[PDB]
Coordinates of C-alpha atoms in Angstrom, one line a residue:
Chain A
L23 CA -61.8 100.5 22.5
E24 CA -64.8 101.3 24.7
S25 CA -67.9 102.2 22.7
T26 CA -69.9 105.4 23.6
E27 CA -73.4 106.6 23.0
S28 CA -75.5 109.5 24.4
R29 CA -78.6 111.5 23.7
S30 CA -78.7 115.2 24.6
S31 CA -81.7 117.5 24.3
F32 CA -81.8 121.3 24.9
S33 CA -85.1 123.1 24.8
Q34 CA -86.0 126.8 25.0
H35 CA -89.6 127.8 25.8
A36 CA -90.2 131.6 25.4
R37 CA -93.2 133.7 26.1
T38 CA -93.5 137.5 25.7
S39 CA -96.2 140.1 26.2
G40 CA -95.6 143.8 26.1
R41 CA -92.4 145.4 24.9
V42 CA -89.5 143.5 26.6
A43 CA -88.5 139.9 25.9
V44 CA -86.2 137.6 27.9
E45 CA -83.8 137.3 24.9
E46 CA -80.9 135.1 26.2
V47 CA -80.2 133.1 29.3
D48 CA -76.6 131.9 30.1
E49 CA -76.5 128.2 30.8
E50 CA -73.4 128.9 32.9
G51 CA -75.4 131.3 35.1
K52 CA -73.4 134.4 34.4
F53 CA -76.1 136.6 32.9
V54 CA -79.7 137.2 31.7
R55 CA -80.3 139.4 28.6
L56 CA -83.5 141.4 27.9
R57 CA -84.5 143.2 24.7
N58 CA -87.1 145.9 24.0
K59 CA -88.4 144.6 20.7
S60 CA -90.8 147.6 20.3
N61 CA -90.5 151.0 18.9
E62 CA -91.2 152.7 22.3
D63 CA -89.1 153.0 25.4
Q64 CA -90.0 150.8 28.4
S65 CA -89.9 152.1 32.0
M66 CA -88.7 149.2 34.2
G67 CA -88.1 150.9 37.6
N68 CA -88.6 148.4 40.4
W69 CA -89.3 145.6 37.9
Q70 CA -88.0 142.2 38.9
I71 CA -86.5 139.0 37.4
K72 CA -87.5 135.8 39.1
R73 CA -85.3 132.8 38.6
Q74 CA -86.6 129.3 39.4
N75 CA -83.9 126.6 39.0
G76 CA -85.8 123.3 39.4
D77 CA -86.8 123.1 43.1
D78 CA -84.0 125.4 44.2
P79 CA -85.1 128.4 46.3
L80 CA -86.4 131.2 44.1
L81 CA -83.9 133.9 43.3
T82 CA -85.2 137.5 42.7
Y83 CA -83.4 140.4 41.1
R84 CA -84.9 143.9 41.4
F85 CA -84.1 146.7 38.9
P86 CA -83.1 150.2 40.1
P87 CA -86.1 152.4 41.1
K88 CA -85.6 154.3 37.8
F89 CA -84.5 152.4 34.8
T90 CA -85.5 152.7 31.2
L91 CA -84.9 150.1 28.4
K92 CA -85.1 152.2 25.3
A93 CA -86.8 151.1 22.1
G94 CA -84.7 148.4 20.4
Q95 CA -82.1 148.2 23.2
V96 CA -80.6 145.3 25.2
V97 CA -79.7 145.2 28.9
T98 CA -77.6 142.4 30.3
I99 CA -77.9 141.6 34.1
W100 CA -74.8 140.0 35.3
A101 CA -74.4 137.8 38.4
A102 CA -71.6 139.0 40.7
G103 CA -69.4 136.0 39.9
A104 CA -69.1 136.8 36.2
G105 CA -66.6 139.5 36.8
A106 CA -68.5 141.9 34.5
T107 CA -68.4 145.7 34.9
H108 CA -71.5 147.7 36.0
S109 CA -72.1 150.1 33.0
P110 CA -75.6 151.3 32.6
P111 CA -77.7 151.3 30.5
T112 CA -76.4 148.2 28.8
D113 CA -74.8 146.2 31.7
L114 CA -76.0 145.9 35.3
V115 CA -74.4 143.8 38.0
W116 CA -76.5 142.0 40.7
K117 CA -74.1 142.3 43.5
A118 CA -75.9 140.1 46.1
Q119 CA -76.0 136.9 44.0
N120 CA -72.8 135.2 42.7
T121 CA -74.7 133.2 40.0
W122 CA -78.0 133.1 38.3
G123 CA -77.8 129.3 39.0
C124 CA -76.9 126.3 36.9
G125 CA -78.8 123.1 36.4
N126 CA -81.1 121.2 34.0
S127 CA -84.1 123.4 34.4
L128 CA -83.7 127.2 34.5
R129 CA -86.8 129.4 34.4
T130 CA -86.2 133.2 34.1
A131 CA -89.3 135.4 34.4
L132 CA -89.6 139.2 33.9
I133 CA -92.0 140.8 36.4
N134 CA -93.4 144.3 36.0
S135 CA -93.7 147.0 38.7
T136 CA -97.0 145.6 40.0
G137 CA -95.9 141.9 40.2
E138 CA -97.3 140.4 37.0
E139 CA -95.2 138.1 34.8
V140 CA -94.9 139.7 31.4
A141 CA -92.2 137.5 29.7
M142 CA -90.2 134.4 30.4
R143 CA -87.6 132.0 28.9
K144 CA -87.1 128.5 30.2
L145 CA -84.1 126.3 29.4
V146 CA -84.3 122.6 29.9
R147 CA -81.4 120.2 29.3
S148 CA -81.6 116.4 29.4
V149 CA -78.8 113.9 28.8
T150 CA -78.9 110.1 28.8
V151 CA -75.8 107.9 28.4
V152 CA -75.9 104.3 27.3
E153 CA -74.3 102.1 29.9
Chain B
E24 CA -98.9 141.3 20.3
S25 CA -98.2 138.3 22.6
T26 CA -95.7 135.6 21.3
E27 CA -94.8 132.1 22.4
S28 CA -92.7 129.2 21.1
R29 CA -90.9 126.1 22.2
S30 CA -87.7 125.0 20.4
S31 CA -85.8 121.8 21.0
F32 CA -82.4 120.7 19.7
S33 CA -81.3 117.1 20.2
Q34 CA -78.0 115.3 19.5
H35 CA -77.7 111.6 19.4
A36 CA -74.1 110.3 19.0
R37 CA -72.7 106.8 18.9
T38 CA -69.1 105.8 18.4
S39 CA -67.2 102.5 18.2
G40 CA -63.6 102.3 17.5
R41 CA -61.2 105.3 17.2
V42 CA -63.1 107.9 15.1
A43 CA -66.1 109.9 16.2
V44 CA -68.4 112.2 14.3
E45 CA -67.4 115.3 16.3
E46 CA -69.2 118.3 14.7
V47 CA -71.9 118.6 12.0
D48 CA -72.5 122.1 10.6
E49 CA -76.2 122.9 10.6
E50 CA -75.6 125.2 7.6
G51 CA -74.3 122.2 5.6
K52 CA -70.8 123.4 5.0
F53 CA -68.8 120.7 6.7
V54 CA -68.5 117.6 8.9
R55 CA -65.6 117.2 11.3
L56 CA -64.4 113.8 12.5
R57 CA -62.0 113.2 15.5
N58 CA -59.6 110.4 16.2
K59 CA -60.2 110.3 19.9
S60 CA -57.6 107.6 20.5
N61 CA -53.8 107.3 20.9
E62 CA -53.4 105.4 17.6
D63 CA -53.6 106.3 14.0
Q64 CA -56.7 105.2 12.0
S65 CA -56.5 104.1 8.4
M66 CA -59.6 105.4 6.6
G67 CA -58.8 104.6 2.9
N68 CA -62.1 104.1 1.0
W69 CA -64.3 104.8 4.1
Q70 CA -67.5 106.7 3.5
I71 CA -69.7 109.3 5.2
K72 CA -73.5 108.7 4.6
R73 CA -75.7 111.7 5.2
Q74 CA -79.5 111.1 5.6
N75 CA -81.4 114.4 5.8
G76 CA -84.9 113.2 6.7
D77 CA -86.4 111.6 3.6
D78 CA -84.1 113.5 1.2
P79 CA -82.0 111.4 -1.2
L80 CA -79.0 109.9 0.5
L81 CA -75.7 111.8 0.1
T82 CA -72.5 109.7 0.2
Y83 CA -68.9 111.0 0.5
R84 CA -66.0 108.6 -0.3
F85 CA -62.6 109.1 1.3
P86 CA -59.5 108.8 -0.9
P87 CA -58.3 105.2 -1.4
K88 CA -55.5 105.8 1.1
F89 CA -56.2 108.3 4.0
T90 CA -54.9 108.3 7.6
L91 CA -56.4 110.2 10.5
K92 CA -53.6 110.4 13.1
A93 CA -54.0 109.9 16.8
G94 CA -55.9 112.7 18.5
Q95 CA -56.4 114.7 15.3
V96 CA -59.4 116.0 13.3
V97 CA -60.3 116.1 9.6
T98 CA -62.9 118.4 8.3
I99 CA -64.8 117.4 5.1
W100 CA -66.1 120.5 3.4
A101 CA -68.9 120.7 0.9
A102 CA -67.7 122.3 -2.4
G103 CA -70.1 125.2 -1.7
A104 CA -68.1 126.4 1.3
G105 CA -65.1 127.7 -0.7
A106 CA -62.6 126.0 1.6
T107 CA -59.2 125.1 0.3
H108 CA -58.5 121.4 -0.1
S109 CA -55.5 120.8 2.3
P110 CA -55.0 117.1 3.3
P111 CA -54.9 115.7 5.8
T112 CA -56.7 118.4 7.8
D113 CA -59.3 119.6 5.3
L114 CA -60.8 117.7 2.4
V115 CA -63.1 119.2 -0.1
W116 CA -66.1 117.2 -1.5
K117 CA -65.7 118.8 -5.0
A118 CA -68.9 117.2 -6.6
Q119 CA -71.3 118.2 -3.9
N120 CA -72.3 121.7 -3.1
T121 CA -73.8 121.2 0.4
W122 CA -74.1 118.6 3.1
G123 CA -77.8 119.5 3.3
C124 CA -79.8 121.5 5.9
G125 CA -83.1 120.7 7.6
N126 CA -84.7 119.6 10.8
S127 CA -83.1 116.1 10.9
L128 CA -79.5 115.5 9.9
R129 CA -78.0 112.1 10.3
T130 CA -74.2 111.7 9.6
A131 CA -72.7 108.2 9.7
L132 CA -69.1 107.1 9.3
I133 CA -68.8 103.8 7.3
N134 CA -65.6 101.7 7.3
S135 CA -64.2 99.9 4.3
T136 CA -66.3 96.8 4.7
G137 CA -69.5 98.8 5.0
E138 CA -70.0 98.8 8.7
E139 CA -71.3 102.0 10.4
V140 CA -68.7 102.7 13.1
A141 CA -69.9 106.1 14.3
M142 CA -72.8 108.5 13.8
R143 CA -74.2 111.8 15.0
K144 CA -77.8 112.9 14.5
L145 CA -79.0 116.5 15.0
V146 CA -82.8 117.2 15.3
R147 CA -84.5 120.6 15.6
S148 CA -88.2 121.0 16.5
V149 CA -90.0 124.3 16.9
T150 CA -93.7 124.8 17.9
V151 CA -95.4 128.2 17.9
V152 CA -98.4 128.6 20.1
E153 CA -101.5 129.3 17.9
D154 CA -103.7 132.4 18.0

């Protein structure tokens, strides 16, 4: 008998330089997925992923000192809470952080070994309900 | 070699009465309606009006007697999907090959006196940063 009405919007802003893109970001905070979209391997030892969730404190993941994402390949980095299994080279677990973080603005940035941002993907979700 | 895009996906939904437009296939194969209430809804001679941007209006007409029971769904398939007509859960729109695809899809439920009682509109935008 009650009427309902809502507007939802979900936007994805992506930017990539170099060989590796931030391909998929879990809205439920379980994982971040990268892909080497090139025909050459990418060394990613001591690269980082910086995660800015709104005004939440920055979260930073650091890759192993030696890690290679091969041409065409995907790596998924799982937060500890997701219950995934550490299985390189396709699946890595971030043991220190239980979630990548949830919320209406999630910015995931890939950082190379010298500290430059080389790719990012930002998810924004807005919802308004008629009252 | 650098790439950048912003995509957005918006859903505007409005429902009065017992029956909502629950899911609209972006590939045009089907529309699913849900009786969200604890009571049956008679929908004999109701209509679904589909406005895809400025494309010609598409109009589906329910059978002259049709009941969507409390809590239940009905999926209306375009003839092109190859579904099997199986009332009351699946109805095939035999004359019409697709619900239509595109960046703006508006699906409205019309009762037997011509009132729009529910709707769901899906909009997709994508902008690519220019060289």
